[PDB]
Amino acid sequence: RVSSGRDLNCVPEIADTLGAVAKQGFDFLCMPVFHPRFKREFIQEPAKNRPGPQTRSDLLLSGRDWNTLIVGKLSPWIRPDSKVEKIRRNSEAAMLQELNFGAYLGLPAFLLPLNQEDNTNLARVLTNHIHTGHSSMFWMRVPLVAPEDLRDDIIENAPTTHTEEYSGEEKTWMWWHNFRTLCDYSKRIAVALEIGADLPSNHVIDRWLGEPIKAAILPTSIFLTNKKGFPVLSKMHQRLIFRLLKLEVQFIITGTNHHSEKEFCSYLQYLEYLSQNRPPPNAYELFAKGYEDYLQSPLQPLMDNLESQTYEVFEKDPIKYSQYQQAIYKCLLDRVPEEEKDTNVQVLMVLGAGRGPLVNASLRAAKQADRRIKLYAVEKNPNAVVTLENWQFEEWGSQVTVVSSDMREWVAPEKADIIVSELLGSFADNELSPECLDGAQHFLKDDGVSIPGEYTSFLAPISSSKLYNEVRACREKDRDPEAQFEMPYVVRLHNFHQLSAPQPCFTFSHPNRDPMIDNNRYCTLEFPVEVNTVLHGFAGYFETVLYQDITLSIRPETHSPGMFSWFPILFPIKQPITVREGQTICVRFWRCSNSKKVWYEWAVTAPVCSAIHNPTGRSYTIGL
């Protein structure tokens, strides 16, 4: 469950050591590749001609081990941003040397510290190494709380501050931010976040939401002792561990054993212990375990036909169809007086019937309602129609009338009491439910019900340097180099930070009595942000009224429990935008159309402007 590693800064013999930590129960070892104290000279004679060997041999471990077990560590004396030119130049050469040796050995990751604000020349060297020769990773060791801000207040003529600086307390994030910005958001550069005895304010911790945390470093010192004598953690430290277990980081144990009566596996046992003691995963969880932050480009249901296995997956949503069953059930009772039980057969039409889940839910409804119904099942996907007709003949009988048609084209024999549809995307109107039902409503009785009756989309600003970087990695040949940022993705948002409460964006209701129907939209939203952060896009959710008080939602606050049929959507922006605590994010959203296609455009106007994204649907449209 818990992948973990031992950090050492003293290794007399690699094999002895590596066995010891393997024995102890660690999965890997962080260690120096040159001796930490073995300062080397590159310019100045005579010291530069120091006879080799300059370090240990690669032959001391199997390639297998180097690749899987050994995380390298930059030697602590290497200071690329030293104020002394000599040291700067020397450290440059030393850093390159140690990095190349890591690469030579084929190490899966290598550690470099961020110990101060200025790491410019350090970044320059790293960047150059990155662009020279792999999928090797760099772990930047960053303190959650800079050493200077956790020192003992024992310098009598230099007291530790006792006034809060909000932004000052977040300086280590800025160290990281500047560094990764300088390095052009290389995907080979991640964080090893170092945790101290005293934790900062939650804002300082939430600052790391959405950041690529690959490891969390735990000193032995930060462990309380229980009555038995075992090592444990404060409840606050535990909260953090559980947060970190969602991000499935590798935990790194550093420092000597202070619980000497206990073993060093006792520390690791505490983690293993917490890991099962993690609060059980909810119903929506255990779904999207493997879809976390996985980006999917939404595809037109109208222009393309869904595959068999796609339908298969979404048919098996317990809640969606329960809710659909109930809405239809309640609507029947509202429509047919008990006295008219046998006199009145209601005309139902499933519009987009697929493999017939709403058909069945409609049958299960009428059985329970003790009312009589005539079904049409209208489906444009002719492949699915084959499923319907095998169903219909085998089971349903002539009660169902499979119509193989677009609902906008079909000429109905009679009007419907109830049209029932399932055309909503993750952002409600994104699959063009409005346009379809509009073209179909002519065959609704002048007093008929559409299920669903209404839907509303919701937006919320988010920070995720991770998701931002994944989108960025979606450049493709033979199209605009920035097209990937001007289109929405479906994604189980996971490593991210919501910067303000979701707010309604666009709403549609059916039937739409308006004489002049227009499905285009323009919407300005104002998102009050109470943190320092970096904006990278907007999450999209939706809610719908199926009937009366029967609803579905993926809006996190009101999310329908268990329902997996929709992940959130993400609308990225080309360039991230700094937001200071207090500021309002103002976003603009258009729904646009012509006769052939529908699309969204969007822009941020406060606290700075973005470009309008997806102008004229140049990067992205949905085919009518």
Partner: protein, 298 residues
């Protein structure tokens, strides 16, 4: 016996102590050595006593005549004693209380206590007889480079760090540390004749002379072309200052920071220096080139 000679400390009688480490090759470890003949050093089979340490030696010091205090890479502070008529060298304790390499140790005036400085940024005060840490001080914000005991006071000492601070300590105050005003400080030496006086060397190869009361730099000199590794005053009533560097040179300095002697003999880093008790013009350096060198000082 490994190649990187780290420490060299004569005692009263004139026997030469050697600490050493292997900083390269298969095994990274170290060794302690006693040489009743200074000129037999560094020859292994012409030594009085010798022992193997699990890990390398970053620093050591005499604890009187028989005791040897060790700053280990392991993060341990160790006390070895001379035994078997000073033929064996035996661990008395080995206490892993530092969370990273121990960079520096220093014995206090009494000699029942010592203070260590580590890369874990902490400074610790030890009772040697008890073998227990008394105080733990996270005063600095970066690696502790050097800790230097007050000659005649067992509540006072200096420390310096990569945080660019020089702390004058006094364990009698509830806030025991006092900052006292530059390139990062690398080395410390109290003046033997005058308390309230000390010197520090920086990473830029400058040696500086400081009065504690003043906290004003009395004098500075660009002595080395690289980091100052060590500073040692001579036994004379009017003492000389020996200065070590990564420029692989030794200099010797008067009360003014002007140069009297200079040695290029080492072909690698100069690591330690120690004046002969028996001859106050003999000076003995060690270096990573594995030379033990005996200097004669005008």
């Amino acid at each position: 016996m490994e190649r990187q000679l780290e420490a060299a400390r004569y005692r009263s009688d004139g026997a030469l102590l050697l600490g050493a480490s292997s900083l390269s090759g298969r095994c990274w470890a170290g060794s302690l050595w006693l040489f009743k003949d200074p000129c037999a050093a560094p020859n292994e089979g012409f030594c009085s006593a010798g022992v193997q340490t699990e890990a390398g030696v970053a620093d050591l010091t005499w604890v009187g005549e028989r005791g040897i205090l060790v700053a280990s890479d392991s993060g341990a502070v160790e006390l070895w004693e001379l035994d078997e008529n000073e033929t064996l060298i035996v661990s008395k304790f080995c206490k892993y209380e530092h969370d990273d390499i121990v960079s520096t140790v220093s014995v206090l005036s009494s000699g029942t206590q010592a203070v260590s400085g580590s890369k874990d940024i902490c400074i610790k005060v030890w009772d040697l007889a008890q073998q227990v840490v008394l105080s733990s001080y996270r005063a600095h914000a970066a690696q502790v480079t050097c800790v230097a005991a007050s000659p005649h006071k067992d509540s006072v000492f200096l420390s310096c760090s990569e945080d660019n601070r020089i702390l004058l300590w006094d364990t009698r105050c509830p806030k025991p540390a006092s900052q006292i005003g530059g390139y990062l400080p690398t080395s410390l030496a109290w003046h033997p004749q005058q308390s309230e006086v000390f010197v520090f060397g920086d990473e830029n190869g400058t040696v500086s002379l400081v009065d504690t009361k003043s906290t004003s730099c009395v004098l500075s000199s660009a002595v080395h072309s690289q980091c100052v590794t060590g500073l040692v005053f001579s036994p004379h009533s009017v003492p000389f200052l020996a200065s070590l560097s990564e420029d692989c040179s030794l200099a010797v300095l008067d009360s003014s920071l002007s140069e009297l002697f200079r040695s290029q003999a080492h072909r690698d880093f100069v690591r330690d220096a120690t004046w002969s008790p028996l001859n106050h013009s003999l000076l003995t350096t060690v270096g990573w080139d594995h030379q033990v060198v005996h200097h004669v000082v005008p």
